[PDB]
Amino acid sequence: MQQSRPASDPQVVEAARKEGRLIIYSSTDQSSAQALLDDFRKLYPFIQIEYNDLGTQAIYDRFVSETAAGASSADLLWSSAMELQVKLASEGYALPYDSPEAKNWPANARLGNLAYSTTLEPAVVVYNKRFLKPEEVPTTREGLARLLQEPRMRGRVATWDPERSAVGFTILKADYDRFPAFQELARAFGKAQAALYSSAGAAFEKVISGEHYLAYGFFGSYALLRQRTVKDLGIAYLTDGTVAIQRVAFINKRAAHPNAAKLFLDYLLSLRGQNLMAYTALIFARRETVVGEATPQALYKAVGGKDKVYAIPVSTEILKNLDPAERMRFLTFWRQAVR
- Report the interface residues with Na ion, using CB under 5 A: 6, 8, 263, 266
72 binds, among Na ion, Cl ion, none (CB under 5 to 8 A by kind): none
C-alpha to C-alpha distance for 158 and 168, rounded to whole angstroms: 12
Q: How many residues does the chain have?
A: 339
Report if residue 285 touches Cl ion, rule: CB under 5 A.
no
Q: Which stretch binds Cl ion (CB under 5 A): 44-52, 89-97, 130-138, 220-228?
A: 44-52
Burial of 331 (C-beta count, 10 Å sphere; 0-12/13-18/19+): middle
Q: Quick check: 47 and 302 in contact, CB under 8 A?
A: no
Q: Looking at beta carbons only, is 8 or 252 nearer to Na ion?
A: 8
Residue 48 binds which of Na ion, Cl ion, none (CB < 5-8 A, kind-dependent):
Cl ion
- Among 49, 54, 282, 309, which residue sits at the site for Cl ion (rule: CB under 5 A)? 49
- DSSP state letter for 141: H
Based on CB atoms, which residue is closest to Cl ion, 35 or 230?
A: 35
Min dist CB 33 to Cl ion, Å, is 13
Using the minimum distance from each CB to Cl ion, give the nearer residue, 45 or 324. 45
Q: Beta strand 76-79 with 21-26: parallel, antiparallel or unpaired? A: parallel
Residue 161 touches which of Na ion, Cl ion, none (CB < 5 to 8 A by kind)? none
Min separation Cβ 43 and Na ion, Å: 9
Interstrand relation of 195-197 and 121-128 (parallel, antiparallel or unpaired): unpaired
Closest CA to 100 of 257, 296, 290, 271: 271
- Integer angstrom CA distances of residue 58 from 65, 193, 255: 10, 32, 19
49 binds, among Cl ion, Na ion, none (CB under 5 to 8 A by kind): Cl ion
240 is in an annotated binding site: no
Closest separation between CB of residue 24 and Cl ion, Å? 11
Q: Are 281 and 35 in contact (CB under 8 A)?
A: yes
Q: For Na ion, give the closer residue by CB, 5 or 301.
A: 5
State how far the Cα of 68 lies from the Cα of 145, in Å rounded to an integer: 48
Binding to Cl ion by residue 33, rule CB under 5 A? no
Residue 290 contact among Cl ion, Na ion, none, beta carbon within 5 to 8 Å by kind: none
Residues 99 and 116 sit within 8 Å (Cβ to Cβ): yes
CB-CB contact of 62 with 53 (8 Å)? no
From the list Na ion, Cl ion, none, partner contacted by residue 266 (C-beta under 5 to 8 A by kind): Na ion
Does residue number 23 form part of the binding site for Cl ion (CB under 5 A)?
Answer: no
Nearer to Cl ion, 86 or 260 (CB): 260
- Strand 76-79 relative to strand 248-251, pairing: antiparallel
Taking the complex as a whole, the smallest distance from the CB of residue 50 to Cl ion amounts, in Å, to 8
**CB burial class (10 A; 0-12, 13-18, 19+) of residue 90?**
middle
Q: Which is nearer to Na ion, 77 or 188 (CB)?
A: 77
Q: Does 48 engage in binding with Cl ion (CB under 5 A)?
A: yes
Q: Binding site annotation covers 65?
A: no
> Which H helix or E strand runs over 48?
strand 48-53
Question: Binds 315, which of Na ion, Cl ion, none (CB < 5 to 8 A, cut-off by type)?
Answer: none
Q: Select from 45-53, 120-128, 295-303, 324-332 the region that touches Cl ion (CB under 5 A).
A: 45-53
- The answer to whether 245 contacts Cl ion (rule: CB under 5 A) is no
Whole-angstrom distance, CA of residue 275 vs CA of residue 295: 9
Q: DSSP state, 290?
A: -
**Residues of this chain that bind Cl ion (CB under 5 A):** 48-49
Which residues does the annotation place in the binding site for Mn(2+)?
Answer: 29
Which residues are known binding-site members for Mg(2+)?
A: 27, 29
